Design a binder for this molecule. Structure first.
Ligand SMILES: Nc1nc2c(ncn2[C@@H]2O[C@H](COP(=O)(O)OP(=O)(O)OP(=O)(O)O)[C@@H](O)[C@H]2O)c(=O)[nH]1
Ligand SMILES: Nc1nc2c(ncn2[C@@H]2O[C@H](COP(=O)(O)OP(=O)(O)OP(=O)(O)O)[C@@H](O)[C@H]2O)c(=O)[nH]1
Ligand SMILES: Nc1nc2c(ncn2[C@@H]2O[C@H](COP(=O)(O)OP(=O)(O)OP(=O)(O)O)[C@@H](O)[C@H]2O)c(=O)[nH]1
Lengths: 496, 496, 496
């Protein structure tokens, strides 16, 4: 049970060794092979660590009149490409080391998806549940009152974001503080953060984003025969066994979108148990009980399945919530062709090997749960371009989108409308639905997928280049580094 | 052999005289004809000079331990419309006067193409070749360390750029300095400069931009019969003799794009000699030797042509590199209907007259080599909107771009698909190539051409308005001034 | 052998317990004894920790072309009273914990002497000796390039300073960086740091300051009979045995000033050995060999004394350099009435008890080595008032300083100068020496002593108030906290 930090650090190291072999070969500087090799080697010593790490102490007053001190950490991995991004996490497992990872992680996560942001993250040694709303509203707006004094929060330095144990309220609190302490005139203050509610500049779609980011991520591969062949599987979703573990968020919004395109999901894993219905389960009906029961168990159309989800005979498996759920004890026990890994580090390094030995494909946590980052990026622009996307264009496009058809109509009626036969060219129900449903919801759904699309394709290439086969986890950490490295190299690596 | 400055100044003067005749007539102020004429007249005394010109001195330390002082000049023509733009030039021909021109030039260049920027330029009395990479990296990052202390470098004051003797490295160096001296949080620091590499916010297409800007510039005229008639020529490129002088950059990337649309280029001029093949030459094969030989001479499929390119019997002639190449001695000797003038001041004032007497059309250096500016402008936005263009839209457009076709299909199958005959409407190879090739490369190629398109059209008008016929050089300097003047007039000309 | 951190933390804790007993009694708020006691108690939980602690990573390039990463720490104890102060230390013993102490220390050190500054400190995991001057000049100016991006260096946030392993050069380097990265116009940039050379705004006297701060600190007690009586000693210095350990700096400049006022120093401790001359030793003659020999040993007029300085039969003992030199093994072995503790933590907690049991007075490291801080404060003003002290006044005072005497002369000659007898009132050699020697050297020497004077007096009071007798170390940590606490209380303790 290594520390998730040590997991990460262990990976990057491996990727570096892989990269260097050629990265030195494809370096176009006039130097000695040795000389230049000592350039790259150290650069891969430079980015790995996290530049700035700050430790705090808060004199907050409780509701009972008492005082207590609070520790808070912010980690800003690398300045190679600002601004920097990172969510906040209120918990008691926090620690300096636990952070540097996730910042040094999100960075690599962002690069895979071609995002400018730089990785960061913060945390606080605290358990929210023991504290009220007011207290938390006293904590937060003081937290981001300090960091702002110290240049770790600004629309072009560092951008907080949500995470488990947080929500819009928390964000909403922050942004106000900033505007009342720093911006005071600065227009870009509305971009201080992300994940805001919709009324201030948020997004129609954030909540389900991640779940989607999983989906289009899987799609870019399942529809890829080059790997179907390897796993003896078939392209498409119309005939496949799908399951989930970590119901709730990302487990769900994916399950639903998943159900949409011909999927047949079978099971559900929950902190309290499981279910099973080889006939396929409606996510909708489950959405109900999650609110009408606070649990999955008791679902009429599924048996309370004994055992872990992982041991289910299926095609896909989605460890959306549990961390380190896959071990050498289960890796052989799993029954699946593919794994998703929505959550971060649901899988152990040892297992990955076992899968590669079982010819089991997987997906890296980076790629999938990225969409929860991607969307933010978009939301970080809405607050900069100070508009909802498209509102200058929807109707214009619309107009053109049916002046054309008219042109077609006339063009045809002109040629073989000889007798005058009219061709009432019209939209399609769907296409008409898009039109009247014109809204950011459609844009984002697009600028998200395209992203996840392009990224995957780069990865496949990256895999082939290095003959990694199905060992994508590395391949991603690979494709990331090359981008990162390439950046830091072309930045005048340092002015000292 | 006047100084390129004196050339410029000589032109503007001429344009003013031409403009005033009507600019006073079309001025809508309640004044006396005389009174108002004394308004315009002086305004054309105001813009002409360059407001700010700074002279520097650098205590740099060589690699040998020695010190030496270095002089550096920055010229910011006019504040009438900030920000201001201007590249850098490392040479020993530099001088205050040599600058004011090019700044006072780029301004007028920018206006022709409807660009906000204001003209500037910098230079340094130095010969790079005698200095290392490190030294230059010591020079530059100190150069832009001073100017920043003094408000001549900022994403909304003044924007450096490349030029001969410079490259991405130089830029890349600068931007880092700025972020480490001024921005420190400012998001727009990524726009401090332009011409950056691609990894930081550069562009897919810069290198060939200029060459293209030449092309679409020629196209907007060759396809214009109104001038074909005058020169007894034909519209199109499918039947014309093309040549070049100044092979390398802009000479090349144009030659290639030129070759694409039915051109037949015949010759090449190079600092070391020339070639000739009335059968037409593949730029590609030339691209090879330029790298496999560092020269054109020795090209199998062309004779080493004796004489200057200018004296070749052709339809187009492109003095892409040489300066002041066209004199009264050659002006009559030239064999051509049109000239391009990619470079700046390849042609002499005296010659222009001779051409007008020989009924020879030409093109102003302003218009053509503008694209090397235009593109930058775009690149200056990529770093402000903090995105690669379109990524929010490509797939959305894509979707719509084939939901429509479906609509057509259904619409037709509905009317005279009576028996059920299906119409498998599909894209075209080309159109499908666009789609999968979706990228900035296509956007920029567009927002460039359109620009060069609209501009030309304004010029034609401007020519007709003033009955200049083929004497475009003036006409441009004309169309520019009116815009400029119009700006400075509507700006509350001055608050003093 | 506890960590110097743990030493410190152990002290403050003790002081708090002592303070609270009355601090709650002298709190003038309308509350319940319990209620208010829960106010103070926690406040003494708040100040103790250090608010901001930053960890860094530097991509520096060596002279050999290689790269290496460097870690650097800055600790800004408390914002209760900005700006904050702290020197820098280049070593390899550095660590986060090792810092928080010294920052949380200097704070309390500053308060004793009624200084606004807030404690901070920085360090770097590095050994200078293995690196050149250039490298260090590459390290430093990058170090303070980051911290400035992050608001840990500024004339009104945080003020670096020298320390062992540093010197004026290091400072001089920094200040330039700042002016070239942040100030750019800010007048107060000349105050970014302290310890500067004299040519930029430094001070005539810094080097010997500390040594002096020791002296006047001892004087305020030795001349105090109230404690002479306790130790059975005599006031004055004219008859006392003085010694030293840690020759070099502070050991020396004190020894000299010490020699001036009737002292008779006997021995010297050095890293390499010792000497002894009951006849008294001229510091001057020693100054010579320290430069003519790099050592004390071989001094003609002193025997190479076997044993540690501590075991010498004397009246005063000055552990100026060695850390943790005094242990339970030596505490009883020491032969002395008083200890100085110029260095930080030369003495162990256990020993202090033993001394109190041996009726041995001591002095806290805080008080004495403070002068090295005090002076800086002054130097931090020279760079703000942008003048050398007094230059507006010396001659004015001078004038008045002898218009008076004239008045006396005339006044006397008027009354009983009846016959006309003239009274040539004149200055004294000394007083005339002051005049012609008018310079900062005299001011600082004053504003230093007065400080150390007033402080001590507060401490005596503080001791009596709490009946600590000779256990001053606490008493200081006591007098400090009350000031600190009092500050943080009257600051609207927090706006959350
Ligand atoms: N679909 C769905 N949405 C939910 C659920 N719970 C909360 N939501 C929120 O409701 C919103 C519904 O999104 P819509 O914009 O109405 O429809 P959509 O974006 O096209 O797709 P869905 O989000 O799946 O409905 C989502 O953005 C979620 O934030 C749920 O169980 N199912
Ligand atoms: N075409 C071409 N590109 C070159 C040449 N030399 C360097 N390049 C670079 O290669 C890039 C090729 O551009 P692409 O994006 O691949 O293709 P394109 O932009 O549609 O058109 P081309 O630039 O002419 O290839 C250009 O942007 C140049 O910067 C050359 O000789 N020919
Ligand atoms: N006195 C003294 N000064 C030294 C010695 N070594 C270096 N110095 C420097 O020389 C300066 C001499 O100070 P001065 O201003 O000339 O005289 P002062 O300040 O009245 O008293 P001193 O510093 O003891 O000489 C001090 O500030 C030190 O920085 C030394 O061994 N003895």
């Amino acid at each position: 049970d290594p520390n998730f930090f040590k997991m990460v650090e262990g990976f990057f190291d491996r990727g570096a060794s892989i990269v260097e072999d050629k990265l030195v070969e494809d370096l176009k500087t006039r130097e000695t092979e040795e000389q230049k090799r000592n350039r790259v080697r150290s650069i891969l010593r430079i980015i790995k660590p996290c530049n700035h790490v700050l430790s705090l102490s808060f004199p907050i007053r409780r509701d009972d009149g008492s005082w207590e001190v609070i520790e808070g950490y912010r980690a800003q991995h690398s300045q190679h490409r600002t601004p920097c991004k990172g969510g906040i996490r209120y918990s008691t497992d926090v620690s300096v080391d636990e952070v540097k990872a996730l910042a040094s992680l999100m960075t690599y996560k962002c690069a895979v998806v071609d995002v400018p942001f730089g990785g960061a993250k913060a945390g606080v040694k605290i358990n929210p549940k023991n504290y009220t709303d007011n207290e938390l509203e006293k904590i937060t707006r003081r937290f981001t009152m300090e960091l702002a004094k110290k240049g770790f929060i600004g629309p072009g330095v560092d951008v907080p974001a949500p995470d488990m144990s947080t929500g819009e309220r928390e964000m909403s609190w922050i942004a106000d503080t900033y505007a009342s302490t720093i911006g005071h005139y600065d227009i870009n203050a509305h971009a201080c953060v992300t994940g805001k509610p919709i009324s201030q500049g948020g997004i129609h779609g954030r909540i389900s984003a991640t779940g989607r980011g999983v989906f289009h991520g899987i799609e870019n591969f399942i529809n890829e025969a080059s790997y179907m062949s390897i796993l003896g599987m078939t392209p498409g979703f119309g005939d496949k066994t799908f399951v989930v573990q970590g119901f709730g968020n990302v487990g769900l919004h994916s399950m639903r979108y998943l159900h949409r395109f011909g999927a047949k999901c079978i099971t559900v894993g929950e902190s309290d148990g499981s279910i099973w219905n080889p006939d396929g389960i409606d996510p909708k009906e489950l959405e109900d009980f999650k609110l009408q029961h606070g649990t999955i168990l008791g679902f009429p159309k599924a048996k309370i399945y004994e055992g872990s989800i992982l041991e289910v005979d299926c095609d896909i498996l989605i460890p959306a919530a549990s961390e380190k759920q896959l071990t050498k004890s289960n890796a052989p026990r799993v029954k699946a062709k593919i794994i998703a890994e929505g959550a971060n580090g649901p899988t152990t390094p040892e297992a990955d090997k076992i899968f590669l030995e079982r010819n089991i494909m997987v997906i890296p946590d980076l790629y999938l749960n990225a969409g929860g980052v991607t969307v933010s990026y978009f939301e970080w622009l809405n607050n900069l371009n100070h508009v909802s996307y498209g509102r200058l264009t929807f109707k214009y496009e619309r107009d053109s989108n049916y002046h054309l058809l008219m042109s077609v109509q006339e063009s045809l009626e002109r040629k073989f409308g000889k007798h005058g036969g009219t061709i009432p060219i019209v939209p399609t129900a769907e296409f008409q639905d898009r039109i009247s449903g014109a809204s950011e919801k459609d844009i984002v759904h697009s600028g998200l997928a395209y992203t996840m699309e392009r990224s995957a394709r780069q990865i496949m290439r990256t895999a082939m280049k290095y003959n990694l086969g199905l060992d994508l986890r590395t391949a991603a950490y690979v494709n990331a580094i090359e981008k990162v490295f390439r950046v830091y190299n072309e930045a005048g690596v340092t002015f000292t």
